[PDB]
């Protein structure tokens, strides 16, 4: 098909239905970005030519289509009802000249299974333009991605809504860390088979879009570090010259945490803790908090807090069960202020303190932490 | 949708995709090995308007979680997967493994007695909710796997005779008890390895010949027991003789 609006349009009952090896294309780019859609969901407002556009619960299979020159290469609404209909795409191989186009997946309302060939491409603008752009798919629904990603960088999905869809189902990603962008992590619900050893923070020349899992594309803010390390397994994040800061209480992983740079709670917040492990924050230029505790335990489960920099928690405690935690704290060299190191909400905490460093708040030596917190061991000169 | 007949255990029915919108029974089966595989699959809403089927016939799961288990032992079926609210399960025979395969963090045990003839392991998660745990004919709760077992707020846990939690992993166990607790004639905690065990009772009451035992070559132990309801007879000896403690904060 060679068309210049929208090249084919199947809507409604299309059960079994199949297209394999299409070749569709706008005849050239000029001016596609200007076509607006005439079949299409209600769902879809954008403006520009639409290659494939599927509505109304139709799910017809697309085996290796060959799309070109396309503003938007497929667009999909699941059944408005029950989101019903799949998006099924099999390698498709997409192509635009000059490297034009908004999206190549808008998917609204819907789930998608789509296996990539590692040809494909992200727009041109910085900001709007990405692979994928999910539009209030439900909780339930589920946009699989697997096979391999382009070779060039992308930025991979932006969306709207409150629920995170996009799944990386052992994605063979190439270089992407290091060339290409995630765009919006929140919209990536699970990650399968894709590992990162390191997740670079850098308050002063990150860039948010990033996946941050490479050091010459580090990520701006805290907020969603967790996240990223939970969904790629890391093992350390590497905080770059600058102040990394918080103002809502964030939670942080239970990694080690290196490089130059220093963590700040600030408007009140705290940092986090939601799963046992140990959390190490080694070599920084320092923790601190503008009043609020430093660290917030909410799980049950053993927590190893290892604090190798500077800490200053003011008047407020380093850490804070709100749970009946068991916990273990352990201050190496440089320096720590607070009113008591560890306390508890409520019922009883267990934890096991050691604070090697001759710049302590001693008056409390004595007595360490607060009444809802019984002592296992206590090692302070 | 899926029925198994006699595959063999080195077989491997994978399922990918997504499944229908509708609610289905998944799978049913003959045989003594589990080899049905859920790779990614998009259950859309299964675990609500679905059910499992037999749960003994899926063999692992990839990517599909699920953050909570529900039991009612009043008005659960064993047909459901049990991780929605709304489709409780009925028994506990396979908790520890629906737990492992959807990486659960809690199970919900919902009003009455949850109980156990045969001994039956427990996953490393928070219990909570109005329920009970009960270990009858002499059984005992397994813990096969290291981590923290915390039981907060439930009706209570008790054994007809047995003791309350078998340890065979000599991985750090911590057992965090939030409720009552009755071990009877028994520990609390029995050690069948080399053991590295934490024990916490908070609040409630505890009762029990000693907190923790091994059956033999010495078990490391650190116990905290932080009520008044309790054996106040073993304060000086809180731990068999195969137990060495770490430490203890009693009282």
Same mark, same amino acid.
């Given at each position: 098909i060679l068309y210049k609006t929208q090249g084919a349009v199947f809507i409604d009952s299309n059960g079994g239905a199949a297209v394999n090896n299409a070749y569709i294309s706008r005849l050239g780019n000029t001016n596609g970005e200007l076509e607006q859609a005439v079949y299409k969901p209600a769902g879809f407002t954008e403006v520009g030519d639409v290659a494939v556009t599927q509505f109304a619960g139709s799910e017809v299979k697309f085996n290796s289509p060959i799309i070109e020159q396309a503003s938007f290469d497929f667009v999909h609404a699941g059944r408005d009802?029950?989101?019903?209909?799949?998006?099924?795409?099999?390698?498709?191989?997409?192509?635009?000249?000059g490297?034009?186009?908004k999206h190549s997946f808008y998917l609204i309302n819907t789930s998608s299974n789509v296996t990539l060939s590692g040809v494909g491409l992200s727009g041109q603008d910085p900001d709007?333009?990405?692979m994928y752009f999910l539009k209030n798919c439900p909780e339930t629904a589920r946009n699989v991605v697997r096979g391999q990603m382009p070779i060039s960088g992308v930025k991979l999905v932006r969306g709207t809504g409150n629920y995170p869809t996009l799944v990386l189902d052992c994605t063979n990603?190439?270089?992407?860390?290091?060339?290409?962008?995630?765009?919006d992590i929140f919209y990536i619900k699970d990650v399968v088979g894709v590992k990162a050893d390191t997740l670079y923070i850098d308050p002063v020349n990150g860039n948010n879009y990033n996946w941050g899992?490479?050091?010459?594309?580090?990520?701006?803010?805290?907020?969603?570090?967790?996240?990223?390390?939970?969904? @790629?397994?890391?093992?350390?994040?590497?905080?770059? +010259?600058?102040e990394s800061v /918080?103002? =809502?209480?964030?939670?942080?992983?239970?990694?080690? @945490?290196?490089?130059?740079? =220093?963590?700040? +709670?600030?408007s009140g917040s705290s940092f986090l803790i939601k799963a046992g492990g140990t959390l190490s924050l080694i070599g920084l230029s320092g923790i601190s908090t503008d009043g609020g505790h430093m660290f917030r335990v909410s799980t049950v489960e053993k927590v190893n807090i290892h604090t190798n920099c500077s800490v200053n928690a003011g008047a407020a405690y380093v850490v804070l069960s709100e749970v009946q935690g068991? /916990?273990?704290?352990?201050?190496l060299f440089y320096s720590v202020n607070c009113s008591k190191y560890i306390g508890a909400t409520a019922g009883q905490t267990i934890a096991g303190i050691m604070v090697k460093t001759a710049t302590r708040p001693t008056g409390i030596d004595a007595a360490p932490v607060d009444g809802n917190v019984s002592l296992t061991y206590k090692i302070i000169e």
């Open positions: 009802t029950d989101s019903y209909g799949l998006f099924m795409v099999d390698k498709p191989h997409i192509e635009s000249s490297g034009k186009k709007l333009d990405s990603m190439g270089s992407q860390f290091q060339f290409g962008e995630v765009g899992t490479n050091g010459t594309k580090p990520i701006r803010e805290l907020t969603n570090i967790a996240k990223i390390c939970q969904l @790629f397994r890391c093992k350390s994040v590497y905080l770059n +010259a600058g /918080i103002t =809502s209480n964030t939670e942080l992983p239970m990694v080690v @945490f290196e490089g130059p740079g =220093s963590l700040k +709670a600030n068991n /916990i273990e704290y352990r201050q």
